[PDB]
Paper text:
Here, by solving the crystal structure, it is shown that MtGlu5 from Meiothermus taiwanensis WR-220, a GH5-family endo-β-1,4-glucanase (EC 3.2.1.4), has a bipartite architecture consisting of a Cel5A-like catalytic domain with a (β/α)8 TIM-barrel fold and an inserted CBM29-like noncatalytic domain with a β-jelly-roll fold. MtGlu5 contains a Cel5A-like CD similar to TmCel5A from Thermotoga maritima, but has an additional novel domain inserted into an internal site in the CD. Unlike other known cellulases with CBMs at the termini, this inserted CBM in the newly identified MtGlu5 acts in synergy with the CD, as demonstrated by ITC experiments.
Subsequently, sugar-bound crystals of wild-type MtGlu5 were obtained by substrate co-crystallization with carboxy­methyl cellulose (CMC). However, it turned out to contain only one protein molecule in the asymmetric unit, with a high solvent content of ∼70%. In the refined model of MtGlu5, the conserved CD has a (β/α)8 TIM-barrel fold and the inserted CBM shows a β-jelly-roll fold. Presumably, some CMC in the crystallization solution had been hydrolyzed by the active wild-type enzyme. In the catalytic pocket, the glucose molecule is sandwiched between the indole side chains of Trp43 and Trp224, which are presumably engaged in stacking interactions. The binding site is adjacent to the two conserved catalytic residues Glu149 and Glu393. It corresponds to the −2 or −3 sugar of a bound cellulose substrate, according to the general nomenclature. The other sugar units were not observed because they were considered to be leaving products and were not properly retained in the active site. Notably, the inserted CBM is not a fixed attachment, as its orientation varies with respect to the CD in the monoclinic and tetragonal crystals of iMtGlu5 and MtGlu5.
Author numbering: 17 to 453
Write the structure that this text describes.
Amino acid sequence: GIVELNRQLGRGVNLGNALEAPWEGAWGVRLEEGFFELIREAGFKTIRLPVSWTHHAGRAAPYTIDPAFFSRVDWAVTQATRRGLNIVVNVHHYDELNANPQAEEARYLSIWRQIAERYRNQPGSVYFELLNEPHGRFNDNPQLWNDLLAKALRVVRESNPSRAVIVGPVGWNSLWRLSELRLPDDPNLIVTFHYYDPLEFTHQGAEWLNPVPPTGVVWRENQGAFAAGWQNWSWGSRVGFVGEALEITYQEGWAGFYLHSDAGVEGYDRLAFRTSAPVSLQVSCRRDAPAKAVTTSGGVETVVNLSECGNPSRLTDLILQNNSPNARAAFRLERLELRGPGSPLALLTHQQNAIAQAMEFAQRWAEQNRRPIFVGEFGAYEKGDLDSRVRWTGAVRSELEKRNFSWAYWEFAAGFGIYDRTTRQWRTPLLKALVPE
Ligand SMILES: OC[C@H]1O[C@@H](O)[C@H](O)[C@@H](O)[C@@H]1O
């Protein structure tokens, strides 16, 4: 059973900044035989092996992969199997494929044919991952990635008829894109996504972004936040999480509190909200649609049916607009949630329940499509304070294992690593946030 394989994945870690670089050690990490034993001792069961093959394969057909690089990957797989561990071999970075899928398709398929035919006789502890974090042109048209992964799975199944293949959506394997993912009817598929929300914390001070985001961002389970997948598009207003509620200062006429979700939600019929003071508002759940005028009163809930403010089939935009030509004094939005025949959705929450909501969306998609879930990457950069990193990592791990998700932390050493190669010591708070045995 594919579910049994995905459960045998369990807990794992990434050997990052290694083989996914232009060459091994180019990004700081060279693979050593002792890392596998350390990972086996720490309590993990799986090792995800980021490998970028585009640097070690011919540019012209038949696009042969360099045999020495193949020997390196064979050494990695053998060290993983010798220590009772699973190993996920993937196609990681591939800028030529993401920038031009049509032209690079033949080379990608030949690379995957070589990889599959080489490891066709490996036991069930060896997993395949077609493409890590598809982006670029795959974001422009996820059907390109759907067709390409269909072709790649065809190629793989030509020699591996029942090996677990790990497939993910576009948008850098964002779960908020699972809705656009289309898989064939193959029984042995494992859906994957990478969780790095919020990006303001997990990637703070990441020198490879442009803009490199500010540093010193704190993360706590009580730190106020919006619902997962909802961005703040408010215009002309000071919107800020002060305490457990949300302070809103309408700074000009017809300014509005705006929450946008690229993914969207379905199955909700009315929106409920409560403010600290009486405010006049225009409520809009559909942009370019008739908003509804509602007058508030302090400490008093207000529920407006979505049918009377836009009536959207898929709720993507939500606007509480200052129904006034002038500015207004600051107030506190203390509640904001959507309700329907099923469970509600708290749009105001903390980072903890935001992680919870993200995992709930992922689990709903997984159950409706009947696919096991393996979170391939999650972690916080070292530029954040260690306490916040430990709290975030523990929260994500707990909410992943609540949803029966197999996961692979990012990463083992260096940047997001849990092992300090300099001191030869485990970063114990992070390790216990991962494995509290
Ligand atoms: O140098 C560190 C490297 O980290 C990786 O995770 C990024 O994808 C690269 O863009 C970067 O160069």
